[PDB]
Write a protein that binds this DNA or RNA. Structure first.
Length: 14
RNA sequence: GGCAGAUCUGAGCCUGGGAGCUCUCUGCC
């Protein structure tokens, strides 16, 4: 899974 | 025991730009 944080996408798990 | 939302990060930090450390509020079966 995917999250937007502070100018960018990060991935955490799927 | 399992899937997913918040968002100008809802938010601390780094042995950072990493399927990283972390941290809060909630749903569904």
């Amino acid at each position: 899974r995917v999250r937007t944080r502070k100018g960018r996408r990060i991935r955490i798990x799927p």
